[PDB]
Amino acid sequence: GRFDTAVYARRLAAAAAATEQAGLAGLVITPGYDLRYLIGSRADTFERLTALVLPASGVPTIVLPRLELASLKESAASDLGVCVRDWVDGDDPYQLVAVALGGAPAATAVTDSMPALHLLPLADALGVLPVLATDVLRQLRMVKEAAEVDALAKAGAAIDRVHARVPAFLVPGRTEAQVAADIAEAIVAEGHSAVAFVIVGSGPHGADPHHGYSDRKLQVGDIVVVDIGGTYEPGYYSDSTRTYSIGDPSPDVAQQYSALQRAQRAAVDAVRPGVTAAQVDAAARDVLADAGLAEYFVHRTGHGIGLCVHEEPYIVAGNELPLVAGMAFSIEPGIYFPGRWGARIEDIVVVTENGALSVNNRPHELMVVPV
C-alpha cells in the first residue's frame, strides 16, 4: 500500500528545505496525490478539511476532523509523531492551519489539487494569498527515486503483456466495448492491482481523442487506437498506446503512419539530461511538419507520470524546463483525421544520466491483424 516510513521522513525533510529555500512559511497539503507522496495517506475527507501543514522549519501538523482520527494509523503520520489538531463540526479548521504556521500573516504554497472550497477561506485565515506548491514539490516528485522507477518499469512490462493479448481481441463484428472488457480483465490478470483506463478507438473513433469505447463494431479496414493503463503497487501508472490495423492498411495510411513512427522515435532519441521539454516536443513535431502532417498533431507530445497518470513535467511547446535524470513522462505523438482514422504511438520513458530508458517495448510498427 505504501513505502517504509523512512521514505516519507526523507520526503518531508526535503519538502521543508525547499519551502524554506523558496522563502515561504510552509506548505498546506489537502488530500490527493501530494499527500500520498508526502506521508502515504489515501485519506480523502471532502468538504471537511484534512491538511498536512509542513512548516519551513519545525514539526509538521495534521489538521483533521476528530471523527477521522483512526485514519492516522493508516499512513506514516502516527509513526513520525506529527502534531495532531483534530476539530469538531462547528469549528473553523482554517484557523488551526494558520496557528500551526505560527499564525497570520503566513505566506504559503498549496497543493495544486486543493479545491476553492478550502483555498479561498484558507487565504483569509492566512492573511496572505497562497501560491502553488508545484514549483516546490516538483523538485521532489518529478524526479523518481529508484523504487518509483522500479514500479513504473514493472507496470510498463505488465501493460506490454496486455498489448500482446490485444490482437486476438480484434475480430471484425466484436464491439469496442467487448474488446475493452477483455483488455480490462487482462490488465488485472497481468499484475496491475487495478485498471486505470481503456481506450479502444476504431475507424472514425480513432480520430477522436475524447473517445473511450462504445458499441461500434470492428470492421475490416479499421485502424484501431488502443491506449491503456493500470496501477502497480503502491500506486504507479502504466500508460501505453499502440495502433493496429484489421487487415492490410492502404498505402497512404501506411506511409503517414511511418512518419508518425519516425516522429515518435526522434522524440525518444532527443531525451537526455539538459535538453528542454520544448525541444523534445519539437523533435516529434518537426518530423511531422516535414511530412506535411503537423496540423493533424493536435496535442502535446507527452505528460509526466507517477502516482497520477498526468503530472509534471509536461512535454509541450513553451516548456523551457531542462530535463534531469529520473524524470518520467510519456512520448505520444499522434495524427488525427476527423471522420476517417487516427494513430498514436505512446511509450513511457525515464530519463537516465546519458539518455532515456523506455519501460514500454512493444513493436512501434502498425501491427497488421489478419481478418
Q: How far is the CB of 369 from a copy of itself (least distance, A)?
A: 26
* Whether 226 contacts 166, CB under 8 Å: yes
Tell the smallest beta-carbon distance from residue 103 to a copy of itself (Å): 22
* Least CB distance to a copy of itself at residue 240 (A): 19
Exposure letters 288-299 (e unless 16+ CB within 10 A, then b): beebebbebbee
Asked whether the beta carbons of 244 and 325 are under 8 A apart, the reply is no
Binding to Zn ion by CB under 5 A, coded x per residue (else -) over 289-328, reads ---------------------x------------------
Neighbours of 273 (CB within 10 A): 16
Residue span 57-96 as binding mask against a copy of itself, x where in contact by CB under 8 A, dash where not:
--------xxxxxxx----------------xxx------
State yes or no: residue 194 binds a copy of itself (CB under 8 A).
no
The interaxial angle of helices 146-169 and 176-189, nearest 10 deg, is 140
By the rule CB under 8 A, 120 interacts with a copy of itself: yes
Minimum distance from CB of 307 to a copy of itself (Å)? 14
The reply to whether 276 sits near a copy of itself by the rule CB under 8 A is no
Rg of the chain taking only CA atoms, in angstroms = 23
Work out the angle between the directed axes of helices 5-21 and 134-141 (0-180°, nearest 10).
140
Interface residue with a copy of itself, options 62, 98, 100, 110 (CB under 8 A): 110
Residue reference for cell 492498411: 249
Tell me the C-alpha distance between 265 and 364, whole Å: 9
User: Smallest distance from the beta carbon of 298 to a copy of itself, in angstroms?
Assistant: 5
Q: Which run of H or of E encompasses 232?
A: strand 223-232
For residue 211, state whether it binds a copy of itself (rule: CB under 8 A). Answer: yes
For residue 276, which amino acid is it? T
Of 176, 227, 281, 347, which lies in the binding site for Zn ion, with binding defined by CB under 5 A?
227
Distance of CA 344 to the CA centre of its chain: 18
**Subset of residues 86 to 145 that bind Zn ion, contact rule: CB under 5 A:** 112
Listed ranges 11-19, 126-134, 178-186, 229-237: which one lies at the site for a copy of itself (CB under 8 A): 126-134
The total number of residues shown for the chain amounts to: 371
CB of 102 closer than 8 Å to CB of 83: no
Residue pair 24/16 in contact by the 8 Å Cβ criterion? no
Nearer to a copy of itself, 145 or 208 (CB): 208
Cell of 246: 484489421
How far apart (Å, rounded) are the C-alpha atoms in residues 222 and 218?
A: 7
Tell the smallest beta-carbon distance from residue 160 to a copy of itself (Å): 25
Q: Report if residue 299 touches a copy of itself, rule: CB under 8 A.
A: yes
CB 264 within 8 A of CB 241: no
Contact of residue 274 among a copy of itself, Zn ion, none (CB under 5-8 Å per partner type): none
What is the CA angle 337-343-349, rounded to 5? Answer: 140
Region of 105-113, 139-147, 175-183, 363-371 interacting with a copy of itself (CB under 8 A): 105-113
Specify whether the CB–CB gap between 70 and 25 falls below 8 A: no
Query: C-alpha grid cell for residue 324?
Result: 534531469
Task: Look at residue 34 and give the partner it binds from Zn ion, a copy of itself, none, a contact being a CB closer than 5 to 8 Å depending on partner kind.
Answer: Zn ion
The continuous run of DSSP H or E covering 3 comes out as: none
The mark string for 328-367 relative to Zn ion (x by CB under 5 A, - otherwise) is --x---------------x-----------------x---
Q: Which of residues 15-34 bind Zn ion (CB under 5 A)?
A: 34
189 binds a copy of itself (CB under 8 A): no
Known binding residues are 34, 47, 68, 83, 112, 205, 210, 227, 239, 303, 310, 332, 346, 364-365
Known binding residues for Zn(2+) are 34, 47, 68, 83, 112, 205, 210, 227, 239, 303, 310, 332, 346, 364-365
User: Which residues form the interface with a copy of itself (CB under 8 A)?
Assistant: 46-47, 65-71, 88-90, 110-117, 119-120, 123, 129-132, 134, 208-211, 298-300, 303, 310, 314, 316-318
